[model samples]
Target: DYSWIEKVLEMGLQDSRKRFILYVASRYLVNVKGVNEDEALQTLKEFYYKLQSGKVYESWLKSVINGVKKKGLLPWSLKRIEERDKEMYNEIIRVLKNS
Candidate 1:
């Protein structure tokens, strides 16, 4: 059932780019994949090490698209991690204006 989840974990490990990995991990946490939160974290950790080892999984495109599609398809947690993204954006604008 969670074979897909395992596969996603593998790709995140293979994706060496930190930005891309972070992007993937962030989505991994919020989406309601078959895996639970604790399992998801573990999966993410495995991906992190795989990333360090440069393990390139073959199905990266499928994994990425499935992860992105998971976001809209599942019920997301309302507790925002970057609840201040808007605030941060505003702060950047303020700094730009003052400069």
Candidate 2:
């Protein structure tokens, strides 16, 4: 069901780049794909081992999720998505539109 998400995850993004991907993907899973929040939290933790020193603390993952829970979609998030992966961003907006 979430094959596109798997594709994004396997791209092996690193550091802050990694955080961007993780946040965007997980955000999409909940906001667009209609997955349960706790499920997404577990899935986020499952891949949390790919690290970024003190900057990317484990709890920060929950923060990003919580951040999105506070704001459905921030412009900065969309900016990074568009800049990082134009193709995905294109599909993303379409999915966003329908839902």
Candidate 3:
């Protein structure tokens, strides 16, 4: 997961993140929810286009953070994400305070 994240960050594609999200969503829909694979794929494509300019990303981000916090057991990748967001947030605040 860390390796994949690093890869995504290194490769600059406009829809790279959205592609990843759709990939995960499509798999979960089919694998976990028993949705037809073809249907799930089509639905995800529609969803991606529909929410291209929407708050779906923000909501998904918030849900992931909250879901992890509720689980109370962080995978290493999730721990890194939590730490990075916290560190960046506090860094911004400190800089703002000093300024």
Estimate TM-scores for all models.
0.34, 0.52, 0.33
C-alpha local distance difference test of each model: 0.43, 0.57, 0.40
lDDT of 2 at 99: 44
Model 3 C-alpha lDDT per residue in residues 1-99, reported as the tens digit of each score:
333332332232233335334333333444444545455445545444542453345455434434433443322333443455454334323433454
Q: What are the per-residue Cα lDDT tens digits for candidate 1 across 1-99? A: 434333444544232333333353435444645445455545555665654655434355346445655654432121231243443233323433444
After superposition, which runs of candidate 2 have C-alpha atoms over 4 Å from their true positions? 1-3, 16-18, 21-23, 50-56, 74-99
How would you order the candidates by lDDT, starting with the best? 2, 1, 3
Model 3 misplacement above 4 A:
1-17, 52-99
**What is the clash tally of candidate 2?**
0
TM-score of 2: 0.52
Q: Model 3: number of clashes?
A: 0
Query: Candidate 3, after superposition: displacement of residue 20 in Å?
Result: 4.0
Error of 2 at 71 (Å): 1.3
What are the per-residue Cα lDDT tens digits for candidate 2 across 1-99? 545455444442334444444557666766766667677676665544443333445576677676776677532366766788776576555545544
Q: Least accurate stretch of 10 residues (summed lDDT) in model 2?
A: 8-17
In terms of lDDT, the best-performing candidate is 2
